[PDB]
Design an enzyme around this catalytic site. Structure first.
Site, PDB file in Angstrom:
ATOM      1  N   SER A  62      64.825 109.231 -21.886  1.00  0.00           N
ATOM      2  CA  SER A  62      63.063 108.542 -21.683  1.00  0.00           C
ATOM      3  C   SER A  62      62.556 107.376 -20.939  1.00  0.00           C
ATOM      4  CB  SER A  62      62.686 109.161 -22.671  1.00  0.00           C
ATOM      5  OG  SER A  62      62.903 110.702 -22.134  1.00  0.00           O
ATOM      6  N   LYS A  65      61.339 108.144 -17.858  1.00  0.00           N
ATOM      7  CA  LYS A  65      60.048 108.105 -17.540  1.00  0.00           C
ATOM      8  C   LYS A  65      59.122 107.314 -16.440  1.00  0.00           C
ATOM      9  CE  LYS A  65      59.676 112.366 -20.001  1.00  0.00           C
ATOM     10  NZ  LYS A  65      61.595 111.968 -21.123  1.00  0.00           N
ATOM     11  N   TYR A 149      54.477 116.348 -25.602  1.00  0.00           N
ATOM     12  CA  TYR A 149      55.502 115.565 -24.438  1.00  0.00           C
ATOM     13  C   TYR A 149      56.706 116.928 -24.497  1.00  0.00           C
ATOM     14  CZ  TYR A 149      58.760 112.053 -24.215  1.00  0.00           C
ATOM     15  OH  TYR A 149      59.192 111.044 -23.779  1.00  0.00           O
ATOM     16  N   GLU A 271      53.042 104.407 -22.387  1.00  0.00           N
ATOM     17  CA  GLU A 271      52.604 104.797 -24.152  1.00  0.00           C
ATOM     18  C   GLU A 271      51.767 102.885 -24.180  1.00  0.00           C
ATOM     19  OE1 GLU A 271      54.484 107.106 -26.356  1.00  0.00           O
ATOM     20  OE2 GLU A 271      55.053 108.750 -24.809  1.00  0.00           O
ATOM     21  N   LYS A 314      57.489 102.289 -24.568  1.00  0.00           N
ATOM     22  CA  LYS A 314      58.690 103.740 -24.218  1.00  0.00           C
ATOM     23  C   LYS A 314      59.558 103.661 -25.373  1.00  0.00           C
ATOM     24  CE  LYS A 314      58.753 107.867 -22.722  1.00  0.00           C
ATOM     25  NZ  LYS A 314      59.181 108.270 -23.512  1.00  0.00           N
ATOM     26  N   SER A 317      65.609 108.530 -25.798  1.00  0.00           N
ATOM     27  CA  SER A 317      67.330 109.034 -25.694  1.00  0.00           C
ATOM     28  C   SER A 317      67.730 109.817 -25.367  1.00  0.00           C
ATOM     29  CB  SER A 317      66.615 109.792 -27.784  1.00  0.00           C
ATOM     30  OG  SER A 317      66.101 109.010 -28.135  1.00  0.00           O
TER      31      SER A 317
HETATM   32  B1  LIG Z   1      63.032 111.265 -23.855  1.00  0.00           B
HETATM   33  O1  LIG Z   1      64.076 110.512 -23.817  1.00  0.00           O
HETATM   34  O2  LIG Z   1      62.041 111.318 -24.954  1.00  0.00           O
HETATM   35  C1  LIG Z   1      63.844 112.831 -24.076  1.00  0.00           C
HETATM   36  N1  LIG Z   1      64.045 113.188 -25.099  1.00  0.00           N
HETATM   37  C2  LIG Z   1      64.915 114.715 -25.531  1.00  0.00           C
HETATM   38  O3  LIG Z   1      65.295 114.920 -23.895  1.00  0.00           O
HETATM   39  C3  LIG Z   1      65.498 113.911 -26.693  1.00  0.00           C
HETATM   40  N2  LIG Z   1      65.212 114.475 -27.481  1.00  0.00           N
HETATM   41  O4  LIG Z   1      63.491 114.040 -27.981  1.00  0.00           O
HETATM   42  C4  LIG Z   1      62.659 113.547 -28.702  1.00  0.00           C
HETATM   43  C5  LIG Z   1      63.252 114.342 -29.724  1.00  0.00           C
HETATM   44  C6  LIG Z   1      61.407 114.087 -28.892  1.00  0.00           C
HETATM   45  C7  LIG Z   1      63.207 112.163 -29.052  1.00  0.00           C
HETATM   46  O5  LIG Z   1      62.574 111.354 -30.244  1.00  0.00           O
HETATM   47  O6  LIG Z   1      63.882 111.076 -28.459  1.00  0.00           O
HETATM   48  C8  LIG Z   1      66.706 114.930 -26.660  1.00  0.00           C
HETATM   49  C9  LIG Z   1      67.685 114.457 -25.798  1.00  0.00           C
HETATM   50  S1  LIG Z   1      69.448 114.635 -26.425  1.00  0.00           S
HETATM   51  C10 LIG Z   1      69.048 114.534 -27.415  1.00  0.00           C
HETATM   52  N3  LIG Z   1      69.784 114.255 -29.043  1.00  0.00           N
HETATM   53  N4  LIG Z   1      67.713 114.451 -27.556  1.00  0.00           N
END
Ligand SMILES: *[B]([O])([O])[C][N]C(=O)/C(=N\OC([C])([C])C([O])=O)C1=[C]SC([N])=N1
Length: 360
Positions: A62, A65, A149, A271, A314, A317
């Site tokens: 993310s 983003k 989110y 953020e 930011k 994951s």
């Molecule tokens: B971005 O990386 O925040 C998007 N995240 C996701 O798609 C995943 N988890 O979201 C939460 C739990 C909010 C996080 O802390 O990242 C994700 C995609 S694959 C995986 N194991 N988690």
């Protein structure tokens, strides 16, 4: 002495967290008073012994983003879209859907009315399935009222920004955004020639995890980059005025806060927090409940400049990787932490806070 002190600070922040979270490999890049500093730890691949370097490619999830927001910032600078546009203005397939009543700003800032964290498993990386998913979707609550989110939310924002520019998202990122930012080690689709630099990701039992295809994956979490390239992106964010003017404006668009939830002010991608702020508050802003539950927003009467005594951050994951980026506009300080395990956000923020506190 100074290089010894900086190494001691970064080692003291990183080494315990890598041990505690069994992180195979981690790259730090710091921008301090216009000077880059790199610290590389452990292994990009345990199986072949390849060491992490500042050129190792990591999935940033993310953090992608903030790149998507930058492309939207470019469309805004070119007057191809406005944040107050109805989403359906930019995709006729959405005309007659609830997207007739949802703004690009709502999509960018996760307030469209309960778009979920993920596309449901029923939606594959397939244009028709993604189109049909948005056509049938109905808000749980009024657009503009609650932050949840959401990958499909900002994914659609990026997809519509690309439509406003008349070109596919992936092509715009590759051929216009990355070159405009000076990024030659930043990819949506890693070339064969660069694959040797692509770190392995590690999950449960060290199962290998590099991200596969998913709906609007490029817009949500598509970027693979090095610590050195992501620090170039942070340095562009710290000094937008050094870029050609449309790109300076594109970056500035990502430094505008629209509402607050708790201690956090939501921009496009970024953020923000007041700085200084306690470690516990910065952890809470990046906590699982912040990410997974809906929160009523406190809308600002006008957009707020995310500059001066603030930290912009930011987390990102994927199944195998955990990234964190933070910078302090008013101190010309930037930090990138890239790892090939998805380890808890609280632990990423613990490393970052120790380093940023020690540079001050
Ligand atoms: B971005 O990386 O925040 C998007 N995240 C996701 O798609 C995943 N988890 O979201 C939460 C739990 C909010 C996080 O802390 O990242 C994700 C995609 S694959 C995986 N194991 N988690």
């Amino acid at each position: 002495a100074p290089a010894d002190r900086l190494k001691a600070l970064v080692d003291a922040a990183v080494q315990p967290v890598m041990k505690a979270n069994d992180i195979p490999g981690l790259a730090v890049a710091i921008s301090l008073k216009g000077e880059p500093h790199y610290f590389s730890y452990g292994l990009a691949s345990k199986e072949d012994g390849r060491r992490v370097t500042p050129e190792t490619l990591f999935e940033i999830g993310s953090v992608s983003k903030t790149f998507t927001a930058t492309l939207a910032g470019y469309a805004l600078a070119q007057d191809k879209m406005r944040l107050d546009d109805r989403a359906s203005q930019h995709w006729p397939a959405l005309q007659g859907s609830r997207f007739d009543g949802i703004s690009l700003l709502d999509l960018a800032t996760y307030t469209a009315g309960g778009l979920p964290l993920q596309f449901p498993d029923s939606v594959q990386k397939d244009q028709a399935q993604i189109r049909d998913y948005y056509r049938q979707w109905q808000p749980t609550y009024a657009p503009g009222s609650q932050r949840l989110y959401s990958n499909p939310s900002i994914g659609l924002f990026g997809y519509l920004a690309a439509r406003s520019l008349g070109q596919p998202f992936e092509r715009l990122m590759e051929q216009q955004v990355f070159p405009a930012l000076g990024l030659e080690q930043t990819h949506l689709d890693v070339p064969e020639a660069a694959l040797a630099q692509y770190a392995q990701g590690y999950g449960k039992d060290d199962r290998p995890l590099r991200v596969g295809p998913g709906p609007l994956d490029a817009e949500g979490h598509g970027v693979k980059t090095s610590a050195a390239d992501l620090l170039r992106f942070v340095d562009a964010n710290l000094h937008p005025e050094r870029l050609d003017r449309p790109w300076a404006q594109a970056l500035d668009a990502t430094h505008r806060g629209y509402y607050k939830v708790g201690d956090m002010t939501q921009g496009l991608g970024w953020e923000a927090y007041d700085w200084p702020i306690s470690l516990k508050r910065l952890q809470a802003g990046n906590s699982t409940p912040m990410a997974l539950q809906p929160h009523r927003i406190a809308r600002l009467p006008a957009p707020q400049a995310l500059e001066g005594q603030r930290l912009l951050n930011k987390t990102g994951s994927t199944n195998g990787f955990g990234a964190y980026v933070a910078f302090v506009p008013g101190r010309d300080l930037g930090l990138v932490i890239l790892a090939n395990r998805n380890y808890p956000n609280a632990e990423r923020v613990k490393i970052a806070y120790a380093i940023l506190s020690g540079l001050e």
